[PDB]
Design brief:
The complex is a heterodimer of chains A (about 240) and B (about 250). Helices cover about 35% and strands about 25% of the residues of chain A. Chain A has helices spanning about 10-15, 35-40, 50-60, 90-95, 95-105, 110-120, 145-155, 160-170, 230-240; strands at about 1-5, 20-25, 30-35, 40-45, 70, 85, 140, 175, 180-190, 200-210, 210-220. Chain B has eight helices and nine strands. At the A-B interface, strand 6, helix 4, helix 8 and strand 8 of A face helix 4, helix 7 and strand 6 of B. The structure holds sodium ion (NA). Sodium ion binds next to helix 5 of chain A. Chain A: Dimer.
Chain lengths: ~240, ~250
């Protein structure tokens, strides 16, 4: 059950953002959102796909262990931040595409399809190129599906060892306070094309006292200058709900 | 673990605050440690709350703790700190240093199993005399800063005599700072203000993951007044900041 919450519209209006926030307390049984329709609309996952990709890499042994170092071969990569040896956490934090492209190639299309089916990950469409289906392909997932997937990860209920789920969760910690703990991941497909904007994401969960909140945000984006809104709008809302800050 | 050297240059941060203490910092790649005081780095002190690291692992290994989602229910009876009068997750109990929670865990573990695991973990002087629910607070258990970084390195590598899953559970509970460049796991300790000419001890121990490097650290200091407690984090933080780790 998904319920609409008009109070959050102001945080989108202020910035002229077309997007959706989904927030679920305790579980995905009851989620609130500003837009029922968009909450379930499916978009390219972009970098949010690093989460299942890392779990699958570990499950298949492609990622040998949580202390795996992904070495840089010295060839040019799109960002200087990617031109170095990286740990799993490091590659997730700087969204090092080529590391995850190689993981996906070594996983291969058969195993990748199997695990996305097991994870109920979006439309599970990996066709068109095994190293780019989540970047420019036909794979799509909704904000509602992201919170279901993240809840499963939080509960160690995905079709993967508890160890591997714990390894990926540690790699996703983005804020640690005495009061609460934030696991999150951003994504950005790009600026899109004429009359067809890209998508920007922020998904994760907040552990606070004995409660947990799952969240997923996405928005239309046609200019990189708008990227900070993918964190600030959901942060504003969760602040106004008394969850963080 | 492989070598240790004395670094006089860190004494600056201790003298500035009139602190008698030690910092041990070890770089995992080079298997090399540095400290401001080799003698104090080997002196053994009550672990106090730093003992919540082994105690939680042992609690999980023995099944006394079910998993990271176990909620430690408050029975409603008063507690010294007001922060303890609520339900707590494992991370919550570790983060607020909830003494009664871990006293009950130690009782359920029992002396025989507690002794066995501290032997397996090579944890300090392995003396748990003094009562099963207070040996680490006011009994005879002592551990040095060098021993602390040896133990934390084992945990980081999942090389303690415990399941990898249980070591991972305790590690996630120990995360205290997450930045895009680095991740900090840490734990504080404080035994009390001590007695005339016999101060208590305050601790800060943990590790830092940065780029492909790992830094293990252990800090302790004499403390005779609660107002000095913030120095157990500020002195090591300033040292690690000056080393470029932050
Ligand atoms: Na590249």
């Amino acid at each position: 059950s998904i319920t609409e919450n008009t109070s959050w519209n102001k945080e989108f209006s202020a910035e002229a953002v077309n997007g959706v926030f989904v927030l679920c307390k305790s579980s995905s049984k009851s989620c609130a959102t500003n837009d029922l329709a968009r909450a379930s609309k499916e978009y390219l996952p972009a970098s949010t796909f690093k989460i299942p990709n890392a779990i699958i890499g570990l499950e298949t042994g492609v990622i040998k262990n949580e202390h795996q170092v992904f070495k840089w071969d010295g060839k040019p990569r799109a960002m200087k931040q990617w031109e170095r040896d990286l740990t799993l956490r490091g590659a997730i934090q700087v969204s090092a595409v080529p590391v995850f492209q190689q993981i996906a190639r070594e996983v291969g299309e058969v195993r990748m399809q199997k695990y996305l089916k097991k994870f109920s990950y979006g439309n599970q469409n990996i066709s068109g190129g095994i190293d780019k289906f989540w970047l420019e392909g036909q794979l799509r997932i909704s904000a509602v599906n992201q919170v279901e997937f993240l809840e499963s990860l939080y509960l160690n209920k995905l079709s993967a060892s508890k160890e591997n789920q714990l390894i990926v969760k540690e790699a996703l910690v983005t804020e640690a306070a005495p009061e609460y703990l934030v696991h999150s991941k951003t994504g950005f497909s790009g600026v899109g094309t004429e009359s067809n904007p890209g998508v920007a994401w922020w998904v994760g969960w907040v552990e606070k006292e004995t409660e947990v909140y799952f969240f997923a945000f996405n928005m239309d984006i046609d200019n990189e200058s708008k990227l900070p809104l993918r964190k600030s709008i959901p942060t504003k809302i969760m602040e106004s709900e008394g969850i963080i800050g």
